[PDB]
Design a protein around this ligand. Structure first.
Ligand SMILES: Nc1ccc(-n2ccc(=O)c3c(N)ncnc32)cc1
Length: 303
């Protein structure tokens, strides 16, 4: 179509299970283009559908430009064009850098604000349904030039129909990254007909991401090396059984260093983490409550 024909792909930057991400140039501006083959039309269409949800746009959700198709003369490529963020993922950013207390709060508050918007139902003619991500992780959050985050990779999301309390694609199977699966998803006790259960599972994953950020917060030159949650308990690319044994059976969570109690911002972050990690999803904080707590902390810090 008219957009793809004017885009020049400059570099393949990431390959995943669902499409390949390229850096391209559109109207002289850098854009990200996720490309799918003809046999991945269902994943491409579903991701285009989620990104076109009414009132979805928000500073902390990846800005979607358009879906399109490009025929090179041999085969067709299915495209999803979005904003490009040079820093890449929060995982890449946290591996490359340490952050200040201000930096950590900006990353955590922006992630929570994005998740609170995703989770929020807006009633009305131009209403927005509540959406649960189902695959939140540091590799799926991007970092903008201004040091704030935006949630991306919304292709596995589910949307709620509040009038009937049903889910648009009626999920019947586990999806997502095993390391970040909530206890109820690992032991298959989650009620997949209950939309609020998917929101609660996203909060557990956000707690893990907050732990990744807090390790990189450098105060007086003191910080931890970058690690994925559960690096100390499971192998790389862990199985559901490996994760379940640790999270559900042994009931372990990522370690919270004692020294995080010595700094008010780290104390607030550690308390949020614990309150995201409860085995009972109904006891977890909501994204809106986390946004409120961190906004109160950001104001206090003078960010
Ligand atoms: N290493 C790495 C990290 C992140 C990405 N990546 C993935 C999906 C995106 O949508 C995206 C984007 N919009 N802007 C910049 N990077 C993006 C690719 C490679």
């Amino acid at each position: 179509g008219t957009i793809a024909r004017t885009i020049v792909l400059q570099e393949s930057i990431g390959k995943g299970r669902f499409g390949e991400v390229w850096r391209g140039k559109w109207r002289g501006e850098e854009v990200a283009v996720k490309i799918f083959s003809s046999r991945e039309e269902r994943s491409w269409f579903r991701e285009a559908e989620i990104y076109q949800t009414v009132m979805l746009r928000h500073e902390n959700i990846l800005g979607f430009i358009a879906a399109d198709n490009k025929d090179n003369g041999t085969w067709t490529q299915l495209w999803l064009v979005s904003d490009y963020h040079e820093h890449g993922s929060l995982f890449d950013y946290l591996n490359r850098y340490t952050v200040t207390v201000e930096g950590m709060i900006k990353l955590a508050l922006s992630t929570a604000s994005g998740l609170a918007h995703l989770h929020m139902e807006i009633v009305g003619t131009q209403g927005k349904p509540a959406i649960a991500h189902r695959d939140l992780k540091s590799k799926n959050i991007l970092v903008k030039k201004n040091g704030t985050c935006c949630i991306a990779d919304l292709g596995l999301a589910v949307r709620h129909d509040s009038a009937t309390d049903t889910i648009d694609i009626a999920p019947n199977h586990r999806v997502g990254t095993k390391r970040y699966m909530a206890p109820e998803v690992l032991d298959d006790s989650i009620n997949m007909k209950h939309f609020e259960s998917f929101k609660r599972a996203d909060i557990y994953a956000m707690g893990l991401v907050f732990w990744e950020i807090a390790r990189r917060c450098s105060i007086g030159g003191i910080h931890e090396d970058y690690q994925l949650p559960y690096y100390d308990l499971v192998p790389s690319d862990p199985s559901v059984e490996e994760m379940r044994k640790v999270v559900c059976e042994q009931k372990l969570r990522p370690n919270i260093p004692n020294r995080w109690q010595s700094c008010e911002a780290l104390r607030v972050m550690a308390k949020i983490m614990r309150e995201c990690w409860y085995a009972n999803g109904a006891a977890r904080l909501t994204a809106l409550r986390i946004k409120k707590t961190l906004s109160q902390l950001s104001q206090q810090e003078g960010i």
